[model samples]
Target: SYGSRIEREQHHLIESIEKSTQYMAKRRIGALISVARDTGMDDYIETGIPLNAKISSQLLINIFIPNTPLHDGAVIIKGNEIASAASYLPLSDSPFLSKELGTRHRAALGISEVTDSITIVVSEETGGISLTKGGELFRDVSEEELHKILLKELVTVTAKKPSIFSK
Candidate 1:
């Protein structure tokens, strides 16, 4: 049986993702922009999905379908099985990276790019999701606790206004 720490962390990750996604669904553009401003992430307005009403459905399809065959032995989802399962939700039109990183990472990056939101994309090859922002790369965090930490950072940052950088 998994220990309490594991269960607690997994629950936290799931809650964080749900909270962030839900908050974003309401404000859409504003929430995303706020994420960027709060996190110091630039390039938060690029995405392929147009901000239309049906965009969520399209994103859902993308999440359910794996680009490659499931048996091909490539691509793996990360995090607690329950958390990973719950994290899949419909996303909207946003600029995504190339296929080299596959749809998941591209989607994550795209989301972050458009709204200054933080994206945790799971890599099929490594079973890890890298956190991307402002077109730069950072280390990957596959643990549920880390995801929760990042999620908290994002939410906290999104609530504040950017200060003017006086030269």
Candidate 2:
């Protein structure tokens, strides 16, 4: 029963993100969604406004609408809850990054470098999707690719772990 509850919550979180991804792509709005993995992101989450509310697609979409107060920064999600918004994420200084990549991509990679959190970046310029995990970046992902990757990282792979955050 406990496991099922957790699984349902995770499913809801994934659905919310998926819906937000579609909305963002259609509107060409840029957004960053960060998911906590093994590592806790509390330290990095201090820069943003706290929400501590249940995650929802509409809520995420509203946060990223242009000119909104929370529109510019990343939304950090811990499990099914949204921890904060308008959060400042560190920028990557890697010279290997493409010249065309912008602040969102850099921030995504930057967070990944320090923690195991998975970061999903949506580009306003091209409506493209990018995902960062374990400091590795995957760019220009389609909706299907995004879904598969999220499921793999957030659900499938986690199932094999003996315990959360186990070394």
Candidate 3:
């Protein structure tokens, strides 16, 4: 009974986290696309990286639910749009990392570290999903596990006043 209130609040937090995923993913991807457009990456679609197809179906977990970037420094690509370049270009600084792990990973990770929500990024290139939660990184949580986590975090009973008739 003592901890019930805490549980209830956690439940509310989780529910809000789960509900916001849809919107979060939509917004992040849209942001990715917008970056692509802003950088004129569309012009090189035929020869360059595929921005949308790569990031479209990504789970893209944002710890801060509705992940927001706090700064202006984003990975950039030359001769391409901001979003498009962001969608595929690897950080020159990260020479050892695979191209598969690109700017998006950085952005996703950035959001996770700053926010309290968990993040799961689904890689379009390999279909590999990356998970970041509670300030730690975890690899691919199964769909069932993910669902359980969401529900566990989302659903809970909260405090309510007893009815006057009952009391």
Candidate 4:
């Protein structure tokens, strides 16, 4: 029952993860999403509203709908929940912040620099997808690439069949 429960959680997380990535990329909706893992990135990010709700693509889609009060902020997805919303991340002042990168990109790089976390950004200006980790931002990532990264970090590694049964 232990691994099975976690397996189910991974399934739901994956579906929403895929749908939200496509939806945002397709519509070019700007969004900043971070997933906290080994490092608890609490101090690095703005303490937005605490949702603690189950993660879903629709819920995330609603967050980045634009023009709304809650639309213009970062989202923290930790574990099986949407940890927080309207969250704010620190801005990076790296000399190489780049020619085209904006505030959102800066923040993605910012948080990444401080913690070992994964940050995803969708640019409103270019609708480009970016994956940030280990202080490096991979810009213009495709859906397939995004899918692999998310699954690698958020799903496959987070949930696995247990050897507890054998033990």
Candidate 5:
């Protein structure tokens, strides 16, 4: 029972991220999506407004719309649900970061440095997508790349159906 529920939610989360990221990139809207993996990020989410809603492309797009109240901070997605919005993330002080990178990138890196979470960022200035995992940042990622990464990281191998009599 638990396994099926988790698998279904993981599928939904992956789909939502893929759809939302593409939508934001197409319109050049800046956004940060921080997905919690094994680490509990509650301490860093103090400034976040509780969402507790199902993940969806339209909901994410609406939150990140230009001039919106919930657009300034990051959206924290825990498990298959959106945990919070407008959350304040620690800013990275890494000197290796390019000077051209903005706050969204810095915040993403910061979260990655402290937690085992994955962070996705969409740049309004460049319409480029980037992702940070395990303190490593991948920049200017294409949509195809994003899809692969999300699947690999978010969906576990055991989530797939096993062949009959494999054990």
Candidate 6:
């Protein structure tokens, strides 16, 4: 109520996403949360069923309950709601990508390589958290770093500055 509608929405959205990420990390939950951008994404990979559900930690937690059919794969967050669940993201086979990080990590990097999206991956096997963006992946990230990343990207919603010259 104090700020712009869009800005306020961002604040709430990031809050929920952060809660879900932290909850998953604490429980050593294996989850892939891909935040979408300008790219629609389905064209590049098989983005699963849509829930069109509001953004909430409970919704995310509900989806990934152990041994359930919906417990696997990526969830693309579109704006303030979860765009879809059990979505499939692209896999990077870049020669230099480390083999030990596994497919979910690979897919996080994969989506970043093709778009400006951001992703947070929680590894159950090691209870490690990672952040992926702009084709760069940071593994074993800490709680503070995760908070910073989410705030920087989601809070203000900065638009990328245009370059004067072509690449």
Q: Best-fitting candidate, measured by TM-score?
A: 5
Stretches of candidate 4 off by over 4 Å are 1-4, 44-46, 156-167
* Cα distance off (Å), candidate 6, residue 151: 1.2
Cα misplacement distance, residue 156 of candidate 2 (Å)? 5.2
Write one digit per residue (lDDT tens) for candidate 4, span 13-112.
7678678867887888899988887898775344788888888899999988999777777898877788888898888778876868888899999889
Identify the superior model by lDDT, candidate 2 or candidate 3.
2
For every candidate in turn, the CA RMSD to the true structure comes to 14.4, 3.9, 14.5, 3.2, 3.6, 6.2
Candidate 6 lDDT by residue in tens digits, 12-118: 77787778878887888888888887767665334587788888889998887778777778888876678788888888778777777878899899988988888
**Could you arrange the candidates by lDDT from highest to lowest?**
5, 2, 4, 6, 3, 1
User: Which portions of model 2 show Cα errors greater than 4 Å?
Assistant: 1-4, 156-167
Can you give the TM-score per candidate against the true fold?
A: 0.34, 0.89, 0.35, 0.86, 0.90, 0.85
**Once superposed on the true structure, which residue ranges of model 3 sit more than 4 Å away at CA?**
1-100, 156-167
Cα deviation at 160, candidate 3, in Å, is 9.3
Ranked by TM-score, the better of candidates 1 and 6 is 6
Clashes of 5: 0
The TM-score of predicted model 2 comes to 0.89
Q: What does the lDDT come to for candidate 5?
A: 0.87
Indicate the residue-level lDDT of 125 in model 4: 82
**Over 4 Å off in model 6, which ranges?**
1-4, 42-46, 157-167
Which of 3 and 6 is ahead in TM-score?
6
